[PDB]
Amino acid sequence: ILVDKVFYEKILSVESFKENIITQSAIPKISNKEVRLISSGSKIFYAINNTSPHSHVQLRLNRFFLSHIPLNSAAKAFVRGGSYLKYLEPHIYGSSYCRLDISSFFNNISFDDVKQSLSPYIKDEYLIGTEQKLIDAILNSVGYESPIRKDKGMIIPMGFRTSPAISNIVFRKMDLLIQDFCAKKGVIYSRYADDMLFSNPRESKLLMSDYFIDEISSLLSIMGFNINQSKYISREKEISINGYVIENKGGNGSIGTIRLSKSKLNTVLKVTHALAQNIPYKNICNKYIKVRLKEKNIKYESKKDEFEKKYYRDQLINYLGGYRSYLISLVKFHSEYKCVNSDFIIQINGILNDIQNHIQKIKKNR
């Protein structure tokens, strides 16, 4: 699609950035006080204020603009219809597996690459007089100057709602290059965010060789992306990715299988066992479900209290329903693609039956 001035007049800035358009006012950038800087580990998440024009502009961009730009089929994340199961599905046909991760994927995306990627889809015309164009007006609502990273340019925040679509759009040249390189050598390539999974069906040591890593690094160096050696995994006939086990016994066309290890399902089994042992709900959610009431309970306004029991009923029901949704998403993926172990299927059927029984018990108790 192509976005001209009139499109931005009443679609992406219908009400928010309207007063600036009429009164010959350049659209401002994002101020420091307009964002929060939350922390989790050694990671910084930029949270934009909900009541802000930039948030509305980002929502309209993600609904109308950043939803029609073509992407690469290897991008299985942040795309309507993409999923982790679809990210792991194509590798069932391979015998050798390799996993790579791009280090600081969102922080290493140069703003010039984003500008050059979004230029073909935005008309190169001035918006607010002969002061500001239309491309930079769109970009001002996407990026943010990070005080932590000094004056190194407009770094794409890791918490903005427009970040995933922009990342997938800008990582299309690299996706095409890597896909072509793997096609020339018979390697199946799939990317989820910044995890790249490569599968080789043939009996070769290409994925375990340093040449493959060197080629991937050389390709990624075009746009300035590196890969950390901490989580480089090269294995044969079996690979575990965050509990998802892909296993192929090998051959000349044998079909692999995808299952989930007991480590992935350990928490739900512990919860079900605790429910079987009639453990009180006080310590089944503050230990297993890592959900707990804060000290500032009942907003420091009510006096009835007693909300702890109903909270520990509600949140437990929600957790059981969500994990049930996860398991039945797995079984529907199996029905659609037929790449899941039968014993794992019967095991998750039994677990689903147990979860349904426990949900019925909890709802009867309330």
Partner 1 sequence: TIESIRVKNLLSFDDVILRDFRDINCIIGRNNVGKSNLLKVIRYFYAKLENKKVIPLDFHTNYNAVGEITFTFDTTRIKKIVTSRKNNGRFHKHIYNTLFKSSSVKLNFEELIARKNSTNKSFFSLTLTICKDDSVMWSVDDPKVRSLLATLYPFLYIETRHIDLYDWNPIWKLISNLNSFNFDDVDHDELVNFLDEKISSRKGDYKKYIDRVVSVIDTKPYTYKEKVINYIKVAIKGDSNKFLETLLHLLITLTRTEFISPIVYIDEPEVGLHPKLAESFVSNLNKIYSKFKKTSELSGPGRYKTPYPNIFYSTHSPSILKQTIKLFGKDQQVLHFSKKKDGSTRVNKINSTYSDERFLNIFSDNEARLFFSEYIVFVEGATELELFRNLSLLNLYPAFSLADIYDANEVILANINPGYSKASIPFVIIKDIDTLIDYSIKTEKFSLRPLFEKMIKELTKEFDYYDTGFGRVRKEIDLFSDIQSSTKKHMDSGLFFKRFSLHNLSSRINKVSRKLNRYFMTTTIEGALINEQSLPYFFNWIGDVILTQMTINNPNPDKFIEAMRRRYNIKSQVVPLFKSVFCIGLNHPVYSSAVDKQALRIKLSFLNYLKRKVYSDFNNEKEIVLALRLAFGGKTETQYTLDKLRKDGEAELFREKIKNYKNNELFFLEPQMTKTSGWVTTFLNYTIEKITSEESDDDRIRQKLSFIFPEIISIIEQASSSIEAEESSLTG
Cα–Cα dist 334/329, whole Å: 9
Task: Tell me which stretch binds partner 1 (CB under 8 A): 56-64, 69-77, 205-213, 238-246.
Answer: 69-77
**CB 56 → RNA: shortest distance, Å?**
12
Here's the x/- map for DNA, 106-145, by CB under 7 A: it reads as x---------xx--x-------------------------
Tokens of 27: 């659209």
Cα–Cα dist 88/92, whole Å: 8
Neighbours of 283 (CB within 10 A): 11
Task: Give all strands (DSSP E) within 172-280, no chain letters.
Answer: 188-192, 195-200, 233-236, 238-241, 244-247, 257-260
Task: Tell me which stretch binds partner 1 (CB under 8 A): 65-73, 148-156, 226-234, 260-268.
Answer: 65-73
In this chain, which of 32, 229, 302, 357 binds DNA, going by CB under 7 A? 302
Q: Which residues fall within 8 angstroms of residue 221, CB to CB, at 6 or more apart?
A: none
User: Does residue 290 sit in helix, strand or coil?
Assistant: coil
Write out the binding residues for partner 1, residues 186-225 only, by CB under 8 A.
186, 201-203
Residue 363 site contact among partner 1, DNA, RNA, none (CB < 5 to 8 Å, cut-off depends on kind)? partner 1
Cα–Cα dist 157/186, whole Å: 36
**CB 2 → partner 1: shortest distance, Å?**
17
Which residue's CB is nearer to partner 1, number 54 or number 259? 259
Tokens of 127: 């918006």
In this chain, which of 2, 15, 23, 41 binds RNA, going by CB under 7 A? 41
Picking from 26, 30, 27, the residue whose alpha carbon sits closest to that of residue 144 is 30
For the chain, the straight-line distance linking the first and the last C-alpha, in angstroms and rounded, comes to 53
- DSSP assignment of 166-179, as one string? HHHHHTTHHHHHHH
Q: Give the total of residues touching partner 1 (CB under 8 A).
A: 38
**CB 298 → partner 1: shortest distance, Å?**
19
- Residue 278 sits in the site that holds RNA (CB under 7 A): no
Residue 95 site contact among RNA, DNA, partner 1, none (CB < 5 to 8 Å, cut-off depends on kind)? none
Here's the x/- map for partner 1, 86-125, by CB under 8 A: it reads as -------x--------------------------------
Which residue's CB is nearer to RNA, number 26 or number 311? 311
- Residue 31 sits in the site that holds RNA (CB under 7 A): no
Residue 302 site contact among RNA, partner 1, DNA, none (CB < 5 to 8 Å, cut-off depends on kind)? DNA
Cα–Cα dist 85/307, whole Å: 38
Q: What is the CA radius of gyration of the chain?
A: 25
Tokens of 41: 């580990």
Annotated binding site: which residue ranges?
101, 194-195
